[PDB]
From a paper:
MpPA14 ([name] [name] domain) lectin is a domain of a 1.5-MDa adhesin responsible for a symbiotic bacterium-diatom interaction in Antarctica. Bioinformatic analyses indicated the presence of an ∼20-kDa domain near the C terminus of MpIBP that is a member of the [name] family, which is a carbohydrate-binding lectin module widely distributed across several kingdoms of life. [name] domains share a β-sandwich fold and the presence of two consecutive aspartate residues in a cis peptide linkage (DcisD). The DcisD motif coordinates a Ca2+ ion that is directly involved in binding polar vicinal hydroxyl groups of various carbohydrates.
Residue numbers in the entry: 10 to 191
Write the structure that this text describes.
Amino acid sequence: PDSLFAGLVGEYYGTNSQLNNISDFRALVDSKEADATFEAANISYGRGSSDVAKGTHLQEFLGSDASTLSTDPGDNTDGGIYLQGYVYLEAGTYNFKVTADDGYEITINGNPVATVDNNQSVYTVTHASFTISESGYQAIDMIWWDQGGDYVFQPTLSADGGSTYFVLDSAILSSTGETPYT
Ligand SMILES: OC[C@@H](O)[C@H]1O[C@@H](O)[C@H](O)[C@@H]1O
Ligand SMILES: [Ca+2]
Ligand SMILES: [Ca+2]
Ligand SMILES: [Ca+2]
Ligand SMILES: [Ca+2]
Ligand SMILES: [Ca+2]
Ligand SMILES: [Ca+2]
């Protein structure tokens, strides 16, 4: 049985090779078991400096969510996270606005909805809108990585045409698509 919690299933991977793009991070994910798992219940991480994969920087980055880490990973030069689960969204139009260093990819119901396929110092991108056809728990996954240096990841979502944005957190996240009461 997979645990039911109000969050996404989180996996952290570190490496001593360079992460330049999404494909490099996905290859890392596919190469081994996660270096740590966690519950991603408040997806607003960092900012910090001096490499996410070093020392206690991952704990600092994950903040509130770090108390669910399965282990304290050892040092690596580069690292990132893979998150997967469900998010409750009513039918309608939405768009992401993401602050990040380095890059990332977010997909909903299998379709990319926010992508930066390269390294970058902290930058905020307002992404194009997408539609949700039916209200309910939508499948969502996220990739984010740090190639080194500074690191931050905050993917906010608007349901009202960019007037207001919210962080994805325990109000609407579900690890399995069942309703959490936690
Ligand atoms: O590639 C752009 C560049 O600024 C990279 O160096 C870093 O320190 C920063 O966090 C970013 O990853
Ligand atoms: Ca894996
Ligand atoms: Ca560590
Ligand atoms: Ca924090
Ligand atoms: Ca906590
Ligand atoms: Ca690197
Ligand atoms: Ca960086």
